[PDB]
Write a protein that binds this DNA or RNA. Structure first.
Length: 10
DNA sequence: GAAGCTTC
DNA sequence: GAAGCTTC
């Protein structure tokens, strides 16, 4: 997730 | 080490 | 199997 905590996604 | 799910 | 990097 994020970043941080990508997306999700990407 | 945990923290981090939603896509292609 | 690849695709997403940054936080705590």
């Amino acid at each position: 997730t994020x970043p941080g905590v990508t997306x999700p996604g990407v």
